[PDB]
Amino acid sequence: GGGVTFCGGEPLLHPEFLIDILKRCGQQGIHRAVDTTLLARKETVDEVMRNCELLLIDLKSMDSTVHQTFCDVPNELILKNIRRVAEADFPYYIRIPLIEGVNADEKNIKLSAEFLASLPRHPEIINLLPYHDKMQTPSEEVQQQCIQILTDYGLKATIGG
Amino acid sequence: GGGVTFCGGEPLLHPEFLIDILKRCGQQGIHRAVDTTLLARKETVDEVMRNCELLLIDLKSMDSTVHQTFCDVPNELILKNIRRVAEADFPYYIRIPLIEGVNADEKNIKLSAEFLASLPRHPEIINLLPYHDKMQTPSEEVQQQCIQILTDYGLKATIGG
């Protein structure tokens, strides 16, 4: 059936507007997914959850320095938000844009798995999105190794959206 | 920055509502993308284009029988809509969920390329989305062969979203 998705940072800079549109979509029976990666305020995350079906959060790196370099923001808030959604027992997806040279190392993926596995509710799915365009596309071998790691920690993972 | 995306068939069953939400998002400066794959009426496609930044259309198969089997609809309208957007000189993306056993054959991809290449405006990008879950994930070799075909016809293509 599809639905509506809000992605990225910009929608979150219009939080009252976002909630209004989400409410309108709910009335029309349209499925709603919202990227809350960069949402600063916990009351807003709570209100978004009251007005959608699914949260989407990017987990680009467990290394805050890598995260700051590529996202212009540290990861402390991202991790807090993932924990908050998990503790709310609310459905969420985790997306990991997978970039050889940035975040496809065994260490990062294991730290990611350990964080997620420890949460009281796991993600519905973890989407590994191989980079296509150092920053290189991870090999098929690396991609599958990442899937295996996540699977080994009891998490559900796939390549692609 | 991200933005809002409407995907799938359901939003298109509420066309007046869709246009209203698109208008509201435009006022707030939010980028808008709309999946118009299944839009029946040309006046609605035109109105959607007046109220968004980008169209998204799925091209699952050039074989209408394959399309009917997997989508419960023939592809005649899908092809008409792609032509209409192209003739309107409006930005669009084409998505091809790429499934070994359904649509990753050289014939289908070549027919797809020939159709798209012939249009007065090409897609901004063609996203090949390999199936993960006969219906099998296409091999790395097949994926790259599909990219090469599209590239050979002068089209811009990539693996993943």
UniProtKB/TrEMBL annotation, chains A, B:
It is an enzyme of class 1 (oxidoreductase). One of its GO terms (cellular component) is cytoplasm. Its cofactor is [4Fe-4S] cluster. The keyword tRNA processing does not apply. Its EC number is 1.97.1.4. Belongs to the organic radical-activating enzymes family. This is [formate-C-acetyltransferase]-activating enzyme. It comes from Phocaeicola vulgatus (strain ATCC 8482 / DSM 1447 / JCM 5826 / CCUG 4940 / NBRC 14291 / NCTC 11154). The lineage of its organism: Bacteria, Pseudomonadati, Bacteroidota, Bacteroidia, Bacteroidales.
